[PDB]
Symmetry: D2
């Protein structure tokens, strides 16, 4: 089975990568970073993010594995000392697949589309941030403030969390929108609360004056000029994980935030 391995780049991660490759050499496993069926990421959640985007064009043909070298990561839930056990199980195909929902972002000017594993956020180019929020073609509110964040289920433990958003189990096909320092006057009104949308619901952000926005997708952040619309919806695409043992999302949340 074709596979590839990305690395954080530091000494610890590269040597672990080299050892796993040597181990894979003792099995019927072909290293291939062009069309792998298995992508192993060694490092943190930031390394896993990169691995995901590196292969976002063939998400349906890939099963991802995360190794943390590293504090306990949400995506990288494998200890380094378990690497040898890992190469074994991967070789004999003793694993099933677990899928998480993704977020689709469409920027219309032409138009560009992006896929997020964590979230996509929108900010202004420097001036004040003012946008109209439209839900399924119905004007919901005019948001004034620092920006808006639209998170996937697995992304709720990231940026979303810092903004007061709720943590959602990744078996729920939804996206969550949170506010960033909204102005609430006797003249300016936002909902304040995070909003959780189901599949097929479309949230559209529309410029009021300034048409330039700094739009981020996970770790990537690009300036978009002359934007007519930003469109959010639960993607039809999903990310597939290879799971060899039980590591429940809530236990992962506990170990990362409460006590490990």
């Amino acid at each position: 089975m074709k596979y590839m391995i990305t690395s954080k780049g530091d000494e610890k991660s590269d040597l672990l990568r080299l050892n796993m490759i040597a181990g894979f050499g003792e099995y019927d496993m072909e290293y291939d970073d062009v069309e792998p069926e298995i992508v192993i990421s060694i490092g943190g959640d930031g390394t896993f993010l990169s691995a995901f985007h590196q292969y976002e064009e063939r998400l349906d043909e890939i099963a991802f594995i995360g190794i943390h070298t590293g504090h306990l990561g949400f995506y990288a839930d494998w200890r380094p000392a378990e690497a040898d056990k890992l190469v074994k199980l991967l070789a004999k195909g003793e694993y099933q697949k677990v899928s998480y929902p993704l977020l689709k972002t469409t920027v219309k000017y032409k138009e560009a589309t992006y896929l997020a594993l964590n979230e996509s956020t929108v900010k202004s180019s420097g001036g004040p941030f003012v946008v109209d929020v439209v839900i399924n073609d119905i004007h919901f509110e005019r948001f004034r403030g620092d920006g808006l964040c639209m998170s996937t289920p697995s992304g709720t433990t990231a940026y979303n969390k810092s903004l007061g958003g709720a943590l959602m189990h990744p078996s729920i096909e939804a996206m969550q929108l949170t506010e960033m320092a909204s102005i609430n006057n006797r003249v300016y009104r936002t909902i304040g609360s995070p909003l959780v949308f189901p599949k097929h619901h479309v949230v559209s952000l529309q410029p009021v004056n300034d048409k330039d926005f700094q739009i981020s997708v996970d770790h990537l952040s690009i300036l978009h000029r002359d934007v007519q619309e930003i469109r959010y919806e639960v993607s039809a695409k999903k990310i597939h994980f290879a799971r060899f043992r039980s590591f429940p999302f809530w236990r992962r949340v506990h170990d990362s935030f409460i006590e490990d």
Copy 2:
């Protein structure tokens, strides 16, 4: 078709109720508050809550209608001046059904079960509130504070909202747990963020010292003594609404909180 009508009790509501009954008299409609197929609530969301609990034993045989007399209610989304149009459509059966998820609460000592349309909350009898939160048999945290609130999707716009919870579209089969003034020390740790659970996930609250709790279910609030466990899960039962026109949840949220 059998039907019944509850009223807020004030002059406006009772007279509207009497007029609708007279109108139903002009059709093949039998008033029956023992086995109605249609329950019409005239008043506010508090009146609708009562109507729901009054008939929670036959939820699968009933379609609910809410009339607000009344500011725009989340459950009571019919204007009084539309009552005559309402009686018409109900008579000719020109309506489909919309269902919302419900919350099941199980209190073990024996055990009692309750059904919530909005939420179920837990507080102490007076002393400090300390409970262990267990998710699917795994200890998640030890909560210290004022209490915990477990909300249905449609209930997220109620008490849940005041506690910083997210608003969830009621087509999502989930429950949301929020904290009430949790103590977060260098010794006491809670997740802080709201938690959204899917169907079949079980959240269990377990006493640490005091075994007495003030437990609320929607408008009802009873003291429970010698509690061994409080168990939350998305109910297998659902509430059924009769819908005659489009009134989207998000538009309802907008009209109630942003601008009507």
Copy 3:
């Protein structure tokens, strides 16, 4: 110099108390719990609270000392192993005084007055909590929700903190009001933000319907019936601490919440 010692009641605290008394016996120190000039509290912040209220009638003649036996307390900032050094310094009068502001609460029906070291809160007797907030005789808002909390500066690290309140340096003569799960509709409006008031500002809570309130003052909580007004203001009275070394408030905040 007259002195007295209160104890948490457990083995550790009582024996420490007995040892300190024996140590004081080696100096010109008279034990007196009726008119002490020095009150030593051994236990936690809950024990210190009790010591304070036990002697709130002679606050200007007393210097308080807190010993934690015990995690690091905000009021009890002395390690048990430092007790012997403590008895020494207290005997030779090698200490200056540090004062913190207090909160005065006046309940009118007749009227009762209370003094708080941490905070005073107001809740309903069971029904909904609705009160008019009047600042210096000007109606500020009508609050609907679970309740209101008025905190002293040193109390801001307590209940106030759990409600989203700010931490205030105790050299600032002020009181801070925070909300408890306020309902914010398109019909019900509260400020949302905590409010910090200076000396001589008077905040008055006035019933709208229900005249019965559960009113707490620090650890004490009594039901008041037929209340006409609750009045908050920075007290003219202050609590006096005896300080032998530098232990800055912000360092105390750090050790309690960040890392000790």
Copy 4:
């Protein structure tokens, strides 16, 4: 008495400015925008901000007046239709002075100092924002997130408010620090709560890796490279308002946020 008038620039504001000048011509009043004793700002709070910074070098020789043309502003608390009454009172010197505290910001690389009427905030140049917070020379925390905001008392109703900060009466000489989307892990810890500092307390932000910061002061925002320290403290300088009638801060808060 020397005076000057700034304007929002729109038709309404300029004509009001021209009329007031004509009115001042009927009295012993000399227009002078180089050394005015009275600065009148016509527009919004953004116009008042500009007027303040335009003359921040002679704050002790100036009394500011704000006219809103305009919704009710916090600094611009004069209705346009009251302009004629205003010119009268100003001419006869029938006014006393009210002073609000200011915030001093010192950026060391050399060093630059800035004065804020509302707040000063710090963000990263694009990468992650990581800084060490030092209070009076004692390391308090390592902040990871979007940024930090340090607000004056009168500024608490602005940006500070959107970040969950408390509203402080401007008679209190203090500054308030609030967080912007802080990361709180089991490895990263911030206080979370807003912090209110008194006069003479110094808060210092120190780079951990990236030494470049986008630093804002009210409406102004400049990038600073190779920063060694950002230092916050309550300024010795104060802004002076000319007051002709009672318009209490809390009433101003009410009219702006609750109901006008």
